[PDB]
Amino acid sequence: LFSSPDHTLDALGLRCPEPVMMVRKTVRNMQPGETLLIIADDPATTRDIPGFCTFMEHELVAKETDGLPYRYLIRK
Amino acid sequence: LFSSPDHTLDALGLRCPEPVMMVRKTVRNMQPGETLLIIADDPATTRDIPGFCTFMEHELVAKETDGLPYRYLIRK
Amino acid sequence: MKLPIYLDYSATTPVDPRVAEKMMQFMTMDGTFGNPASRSHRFGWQAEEAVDIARNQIADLVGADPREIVFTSGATESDNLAIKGAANFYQKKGKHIITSKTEHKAVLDTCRQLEREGFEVTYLAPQRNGIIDLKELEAAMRDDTILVSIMHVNNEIGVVQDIAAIGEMCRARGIIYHVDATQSVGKLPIDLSQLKVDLMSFSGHKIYGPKGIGALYVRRKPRVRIEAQMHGGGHERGMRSGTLPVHQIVGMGEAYRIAKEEMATEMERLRGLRNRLWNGIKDIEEVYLNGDLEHGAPNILNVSFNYVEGESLIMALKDLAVSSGSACLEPSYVLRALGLNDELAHSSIRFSLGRFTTEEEIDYTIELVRKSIGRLRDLSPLWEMYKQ
Amino acid sequence: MKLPIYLDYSATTPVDPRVAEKMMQFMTMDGTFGNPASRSHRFGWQAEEAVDIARNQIADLVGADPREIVFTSGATESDNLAIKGAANFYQKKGKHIITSKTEHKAVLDTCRQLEREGFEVTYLAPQRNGIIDLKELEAAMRDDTILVSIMHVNNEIGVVQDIAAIGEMCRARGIIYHVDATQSVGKLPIDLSQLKVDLMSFSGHKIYGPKGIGALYVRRKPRVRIEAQMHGGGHERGMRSGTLPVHQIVGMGEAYRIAKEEMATEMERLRGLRNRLWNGIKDIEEVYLNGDLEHGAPNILNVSFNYVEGESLIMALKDLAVSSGSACLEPSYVLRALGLNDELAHSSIRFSLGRFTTEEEIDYTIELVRKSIGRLRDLSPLWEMYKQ
Numbered sequence: 004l005f006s007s008p009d010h011t012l013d014a015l016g017l018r019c020p021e022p023v024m025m026v027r028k029t030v031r032n033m034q035p036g037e038t039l040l041i042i043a044d045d046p047a048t049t050r051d052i053p054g055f056c057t058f059m060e061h062e063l064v065a066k067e068t069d070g071l072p073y074r075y076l077i078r079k
Numbered sequence: 080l081f082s083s084p085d086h087t088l089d090a091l092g093l094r095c096p097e098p099v100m101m102v103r104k105t106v107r108n109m110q111p112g113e114t115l116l117i118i119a120d121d122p123a124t125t126r127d128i129p130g131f132c133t134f135m136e137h138e139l140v141a142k143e144t145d146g147l148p149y150r151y152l153i154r155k
Numbered sequence: 156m157k158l159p160i161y162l163d164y165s166a167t168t169p170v171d172p173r174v175a176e177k178m179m180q181f182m183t184m185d186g187t188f189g190n191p192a193s194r195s196h197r198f199g200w201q202a203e204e205a206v207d208i209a210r211n212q213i214a215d216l217v218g219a220d221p222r223e224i225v226f227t228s229g230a231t232e233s234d235n236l237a238i239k240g241a242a243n244f245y246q247k248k249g250k251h252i253i254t255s256k257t258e259h260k261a262v263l264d265t266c267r268q269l270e271r272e273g274f275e276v277t278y279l280a281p282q283r284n285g286i287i288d289l290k291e292l293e294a295a296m297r298d299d300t301i302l303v304s305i306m307h308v309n310n311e312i313g314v315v316q317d318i319a320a321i322g323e324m325c326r327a328r329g330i331i332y333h334v335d336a337t338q339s340v341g342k343l344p345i346d347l348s349q350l351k352v353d354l355m356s357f358s359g360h361k362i363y364g365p366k367g368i369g370a371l372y373v374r375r376k377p378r379v380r381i382e383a384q385m386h387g388g389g390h391e392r393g394m395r396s397g398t399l400p401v402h403q404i405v406g407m408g409e410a411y412r413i414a415k416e417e418m419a420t421e422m423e424r425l426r427g428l429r430n431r432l433w434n435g436i437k438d439i440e441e442v443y444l445n446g447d448l449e450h451g452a453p454n455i456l457n458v459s460f461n462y463v464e465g466e467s468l469i470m471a472l473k474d475l476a477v478s479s480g481s482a483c484l485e486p487s488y489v490l491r492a493l494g495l496n497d498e499l500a501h502s503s504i505r506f507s508l509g510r511f512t513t514e515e516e517i518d519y520t521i522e523l524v525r526k527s528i529g530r531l532r533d534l535s536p537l538w539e540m541y542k543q
Numbered sequence: 544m545k546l547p548i549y550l551d552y553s554a555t556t557p558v559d560p561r562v563a564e565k566m567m568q569f570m571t572m573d574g575t576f577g578n579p580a581s582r583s584h585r586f587g588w589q590a591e592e593a594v595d596i597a598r599n600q601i602a603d604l605v606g607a608d609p610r611e612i613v614f615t616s617g618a619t620e621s622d623n624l625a626i627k628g629a630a631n632f633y634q635k636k637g638k639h640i641i642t643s644k645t646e647h648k649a650v651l652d653t654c655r656q657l658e659r660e661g662f663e664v665t666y667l668a669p670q671r672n673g674i675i676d677l678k679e680l681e682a683a684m685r686d687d688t689i690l691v692s693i694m695h696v697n698n699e700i701g702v703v704q705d706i707a708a709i710g711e712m713c714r715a716r717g718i719i720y721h722v723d724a725t726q727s728v729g730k731l732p733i734d735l736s737q738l739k740v741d742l743m744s745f746s747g748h749k750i751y752g753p754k755g756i757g758a759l760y761v762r763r764k765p766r767v768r769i770e771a772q773m774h775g776g777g778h779e780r781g782m783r784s785g786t787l788p789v790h791q792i793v794g795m796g797e798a799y800r801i802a803k804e805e806m807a808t809e810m811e812r813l814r815g816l817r818n819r820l821w822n823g824i825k826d827i828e829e830v831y832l833n834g835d836l837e838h839g840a841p842n843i844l845n846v847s848f849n850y851v852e853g854e855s856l857i858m859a860l861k862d863l864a865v866s867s868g869s870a871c872l873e874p875s876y877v878l879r880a881l882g883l884n885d886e887l888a889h890s891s892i893r894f895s896l897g898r899f900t901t902e903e904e905i906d907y908t909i910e911l912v913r914k915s916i917g918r919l920r921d922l923s924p925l926w927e928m929y930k931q
């Protein structure tokens with residue numbers, strides 16, 4: 004679900020490329036196997052946050068795209 | 080003297096940094112121990128062509144500075 | 156043979172082991188790390204020599220004189236420098252500029268800024284094959300035209316322009332001709348002693364040199380002039396201030412020297428691999444060639460696959476490293492200029508070849524494309540339509 | 544101990560073996576050579592990661608946010624970008640700019656170009672010690688002033704300005720404050736979360752990173768804006784287009800991270816060597832200190848030797864690699880601003896210390912200077928005059 008994320012990244016009002024930058028930094032200060040709730044309203048994140056998990060090899064858990072704010076739960 | 084140079088570099092009308100560039104290239108296509116008459120009217124060559132021979136390790140043979148065109152005979 | 160298979164040499168190339176090795180001799184305390192602008196000691200003087208050896212290496216590739224080569228931080232800068240530099244210097248002769256609607260962004264974005272500054276810019280549409288209509292180019296030229304920028308080789312579709320003839324049209328009218336040769340340098344022959352180009356841009360990382368360096372040709376004779384864009388001490392004969400980056404500069408010049416040597420051999424080999432590739436896929440049903448097969452760069456091949464949803468095309472060729480030329484949702488601005496619709500443009504792949512590309516990789520590529528375009532079409536509501 | 548002895552760290556520094564080694568991992572086919580702007584494959588994505596790791600490394604040195612760091616080709620570019628970018632963006636608030644007559648050429652030459660474009664620029668004279676009179680700075684500020692550029696540490700004399708206080712004067716009036724921190728970065732502490740600087744320039748090769756790379760701080764909060772000077776695709780959040788040079792970028796960020804670590808230790812060591820040097824030569828008869836001993840960079844020492852013909856001074860210290868700060872016949876424009884006459888300015892040497900400088904080198908230096916200034920004066924018609 005979207006209930007027990009250990010980390011919460013608010014990225015509201017941020018626009019590409021800023022979201023991927025913020026997310027990039029967070030995963031570094033994160034331990035391998037941790038949760039991260041991303042709150043964004045940048046539409047480009049529908050392509051770019053899955054792209055991150057795909058090309059940087061992370062676990063895209065649960066998604067939200069059908070209404071703002073979008074939510075993206077991710078695990079290292 | 081200024082009579083039997085095997086190479087003649089005309090650099091008249093050229094202005095720093097152009098003279099040192101032309102001279103630089105000539106010494107490369109030259110065999111170690113060869114003569115090169117430089118004809119320049121760039122006043123900066125009074126400092127820069129001796130500077131070349133000094134910092135690039137070549138033989139400053141005979142000089143001319145007291146009237147234009149200046150003449151500089153050099154040997155590799 | 157590893158995966159992905161890099162087919163994006165036009166995005167950027169890898170640095171030659173020979174190039175990178177030279178660049179090592181100009182870094183640390185025991186190398187030639189000195190600033191070539193310090194002339195009170197040996198450090199500076201020998202550094203300046205390294206610069207000069209590279210500046211010549213570059214010059215000899217393109218038939219220029221070393222005194223015509225200006226160091227920049229990249230092809231992007233050369234294009235800004237060349238265009239705004241020339242436009243500003245000659246603005247008293249007129250304010251009109253002409254370029255092509257398929258030029259790289261450095262040229263296009265630069266012209267758009269000049270339009271803010273009071274310049275008028277005509278963007279010519281290309282024909283379907285990508286070539287500019289020279290008579291349409293002529294109909295655009297005016298009394299108050301001062302500059303034309305049309306690139307040698309296009310980086311998306313590979314198409315080659317007649318820069319010689321364009322150069323002749325320019326000179327005869329006193330118009331400055333700028334050429335973006337990033338893609339063509341070290342691929343097609345170039346001799347400025349013969350060509351009527353006044354300004355020409357090029358970079359290093361498209362020819363196995365390092366990113367972050369490039370140069371700008373500026374014609375000595377007849378004399379062309381530009382206003383500097385980069386101020387602070389007046390280096391590069393007043394046209395580009397700033398400390399010269401020696402190692403970067405050395406790596407570039409070495410790359411240009413290898414290019415002079417290996418060019419002929421290499422472009423005949425690539426031109427063959429290019430033809431190997433298009434033949435193993437030209438037989439597929441709905442595939443189109445964007446550009447020119449005869450008169451196009453030997454190393455670029457841009458093909459369109461019809462009746463396939465493009466979003467998934469790339470996800471299907473994950474075994475390949477290529478690009479569609481789309482921009483962080485929407486589709487190559489070059490293919491849209493050629494005239495294709497957004498859906499077709501979206502499902503086009505640009506294959507760009509290079510030094511490390513083999514026949515094994517090409518054949519593997521051929522196979523993957525058949526099986527991939529095959530599977531997508533199987534599951535395509537669009538193909539079933541076409542199959543009526 | 545080899546000769547020459549490099550004492551020109553302020554001209555440029557050598558690249559750290561640690562820095563250069565990182566820069567190797569981002570070059571050749573088997574490294575991360577991909578273009579960080581290609582997002583359809585793995586090559587690009589991991590390259591972009593390297594960039595981001597370095598962008599942060601940089602940010603953390605100066606208390607910025609990574610989203611505030613803009614990549615450039617060098618400090619020269621940052622100064623052009625910052626100044627013309629800010630001046631052009633805010634030109635509707637007024638056209639007046641203020642800077643100091645002793646700023647680096649990148650700032651000075653940039654302002655002079657803006658004066659061509661219709662901007663008014665006040666160049667403030669420094670006091671004899673190099674510091675700007677803040678009340679003279681205040682008397683210059685107007686309604687229509689939009690920008691102030693005053694550097695943190697001067698590169699000729701080493702003098703440090705009160706950028707904190709200048710920042711306060713700027714903010715209180717809505718004036719943009721640009722700071723050239725090329726010399727100060729990684730030497731004096733810097734924390735933009737506290738400082739009221741809006742734009743700040745820095746480079747890499749003055750801190751043991753590579754030439755040809757540098758950055759520009761742009762304040763996120765309160766929001767500062769600039770017009771891009773480099774067009775073509777809108778990279779770095781629209782402020783500096785062009786392919787990012789990954790290796791260059793990596794080398795810079797590593798250099799900034801080492802700097803955060805080793806800074807304290809190193810600047811206390813240099814500050815001691817600086818004091819070792821001035822003490823072993825302060826006893827010579829006609830020697831003057833240009834700048835400030837207490838409140839000056841720990842690594843720069845600019846001294847004047849009176850009654851000696853300067854042309855030969857340098858030829859006398861050929862065992863040292865330093866600079867007088869003269870320009871391809873005439874004399875440091877900074878020392879002339881401080882007020883010294885052309886002859887004294889000509890016979891001044893700037894000693895700049897760094898990572899590889901020892902006590903052995905300093906002591907050897909001390910000795911050489913006594914014996915050298917001694918011999919020159921022996922043969923000086925000028926000294927005999929002074930000896931009356």
Ligand SMILES: *Cc1c(COP(=O)(O)O)cnc(C)c1O
Pocket residue numbers: 165166228229230231232259261306310335337338358359360361367368369785786
């Ligand atoms: C890649 C490219 C450029 C960009 O050069 P950079 O060195 O990345 O700034 C410019 N023009 C063309 C045609 C290109 O293909």
Ligand SMILES: *Cc1c(COP(=O)(O)O)cnc(C)c1O
Pocket residue numbers: 397398553554616617618619620647649694698723725726746747748749755756757
């Ligand atoms: C050296 C220096 C510069 C120049 O930076 P580059 O990277 O060489 O372009 C700019 N400002 C100051 C204060 C400097 O000392």
